[PDB]
Amino acid sequence: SISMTTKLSYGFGAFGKDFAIGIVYMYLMYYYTDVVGLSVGLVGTLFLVARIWDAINCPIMGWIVNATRSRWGKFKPWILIGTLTNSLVLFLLFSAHLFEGTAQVVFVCVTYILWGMTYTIMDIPFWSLVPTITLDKREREQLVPFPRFFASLAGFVTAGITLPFVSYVGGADRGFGFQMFTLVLIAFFIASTIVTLRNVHEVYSSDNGVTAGRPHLTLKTIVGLIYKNDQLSCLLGMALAYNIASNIINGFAIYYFTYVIGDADLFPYYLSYAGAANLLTLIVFPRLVKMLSRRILWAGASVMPVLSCAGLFAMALADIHNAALIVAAGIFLNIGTALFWVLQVIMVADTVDYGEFKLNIRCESIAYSVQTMVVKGGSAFAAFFIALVLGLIGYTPNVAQSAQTLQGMQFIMIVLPVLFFMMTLVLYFRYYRLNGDMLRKIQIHLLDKYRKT
Ligand SMILES: CCCCCCCCCCCCO[C@@H]1O[C@H](CO[C@H]2O[C@H](CO)[C@H](O)[C@H](O)[C@H]2O)[C@@H](O)[C@H](O)[C@H]1O
Numbered sequence: 392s393i394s395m396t397t398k399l400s401y402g403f404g405a406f407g408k409d410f411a412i413g414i415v416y417m418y419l420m421y422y423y424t425d426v427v428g429l430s431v432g433l434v435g436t437l438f439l440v441a442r443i444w445d446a447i448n449c450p451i452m453g454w455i456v457n458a459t460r461s462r463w464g465k466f467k468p469w470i471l472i473g474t475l476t477n478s479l480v481l482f483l484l485f486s487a488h489l490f491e492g493t494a495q496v497v498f499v500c501v502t503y504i505l506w507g508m509t510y511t512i513m514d515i516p517f518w519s520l521v522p523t524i525t526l527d528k529r530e531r532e533q534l535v536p537f538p539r540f541f542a543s544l545a546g547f548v549t550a551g552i553t554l555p556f557v558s559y560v561g562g563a564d565r566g567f568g569f570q571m572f573t574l575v576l577i578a579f580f581i582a583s584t585i586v587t588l589r590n591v592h593e594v595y596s597s598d599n600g601v602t603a604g605r606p607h608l609t610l611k612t613i614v615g616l617i618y619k620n621d622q623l624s625c626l627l628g629m630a631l632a633y634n635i636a637s638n639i640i641n642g643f644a645i646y647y648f649t650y651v652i653g654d655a656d657l658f659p660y661y662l663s664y665a666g667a668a669n670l671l672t673l674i675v676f677p678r679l680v681k682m683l684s685r686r687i688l689w690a691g692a693s694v695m696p697v698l699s700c701a702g703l704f705a706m707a708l709a710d711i712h713n714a715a716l717i718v719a720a721g722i723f724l725n726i727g728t729a730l731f732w733v734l735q736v737i738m739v740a741d742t743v744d745y746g747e748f749k750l751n752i753r754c755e756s757i758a759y760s761v762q763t764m765v766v767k768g769g770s771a772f773a774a775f776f777i778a779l780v781l782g783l784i785g786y787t788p789n790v791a792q793s794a795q796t797l798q799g800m801q802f803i804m805i806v807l808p809v810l811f812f813m814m815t816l817v818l819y820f821r822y823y824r825l826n827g828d829m830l831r832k833i834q835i836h837l838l839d840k841y842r843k844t
Pocket residue numbers: 408409412413416514542543546547550634637638641665728732763766767
């Protein structure tokens with residue numbers, strides 16, 4: 392079985408990994424708009440362009456990771472490089488409050504696009520380690536929950552005690568407190584990197600002797616291996632749909648909690664219950680995946696946020712606000728997202744296995760590049776579709792609109808995520824085949840095939 396040591400070390404690695412990007416994801420807009428003083432249009436355009444650039448960069452990083460040959464491995468060197476460079480670029484990212492004028496703008500833009508690329512560097516090869524740690528069904532099912540739980544916990548501890556830190560350390564200067572807390576983030580991040588590098592021992596890697604990998608591959612060949620691997624392209628589409636839906640819902644939540652307070656002091660309780668639900672469902676996944684089916688857990692992952700959307704739709708109809716319904720929708724969404732992420736990591740591992748099985752090529756970096764680029768492109772496409780719907784409904788001026796227009800806009804914003812969720816689950820139940828007998832066939836084929844020359 393997987394070493395408990397390796398399980399917990401991968402967990403801590405994921406914790407430090409997502410403890411460095413939680414601050415960014417959650418408060419970089421607040422820093423740039425409330426500490427630096429930059430127009431919201433600039434920040435939005437930069438964020439969108441940077442997410443597009445990162446999505447395009449992802450496959451390039453996958454090609455790089457597969458082609459690299461080195462002593463530590465083909466993942467660990469890039470993991471280390473990315474961790475260190477991203478820590479540095481993060482510190483620079485939050486040191487933007489120093490400059491002013493065009494200098495400040497250029498600094499912000501450069502540091503942001505860097506931070507993005509740098510995080511890609513290590514994000515792809517990091518998650519590329521689960522397929523090489525093991526290729527068994529239950530072993531993966533009880534391996535992935537550890538890093539997913541630790542990542543969620545990092546995000547939630549950020550959400551919780553990121554502001555108190557910045558307040559206690561130089562309360563007058565918010566930028567100083569930000570760049571100081573960045574030091575705590577960097578310390579945890581580098582410690583976790585060292586832990587995972589020392590303890591995680593890739594077993595079925597693409598750079599070992601018996602694997603079916605080919606380090607000398609072109610960018611065209613690799614990126615086309617996504618379409619040739621029908622299951623990987625199916626996962627691409629499914630994850631894209633789910634990410635677009637989750638992004639639209641999370642944006643609705645941010646707009647309904649920030650602009651409209653919803654109710655003073657509601658967000659702490661909502662976040663507490665959401666984190667509790669997410670962490671619990673991640674803890675009890677190793678038992679749920681067996682009590683229920685993997686297919687049924689995916690169905691639930693896509694249906695629970697749909698039930699949340701329906702609840703808050705019924706709410707929007709009459710009840711402008713019901714704290715109970717709010718936190719219930721939050722709990723449902725969080726359970727769905729936890730299930731989705733765990734199953735998605737396990738499934739990208741299964742897809743690299745199936746690619747070795749069909750195309751006779753083992754390439755984990757490309758599957759996880761697909762994962763990361765889909766994460767970025769989910770936000771990208773959610774923004775695109777929201778702008779499209781706003782222009783269609785007549786919100787393109789953004790100066791003054793009808794109350795009925797706003798109500799219809801809310802209704803459309805609630806309905807579209809449901810469309811994307813039903814898309815992801817129909818695609819799953821109509822195209823995906825890597826469950827049950829198929830998985831064991833692939834596993835046995837690979838194991839028996841691992842009998843070197
Ligand atoms: C606090 C407010 C309520 C709860 C959270 C908001 C609702 C989720 C809406 C987007 C779901 C896409 O997924 C998330 O994406 C983030 C980036 O990191 C993710 O994406 C990266 C890829 O760029 C890395 O893989 C990283 O490990 C992975 O967690 C992580 O912060 C989250 O935890 C992870 O759920």
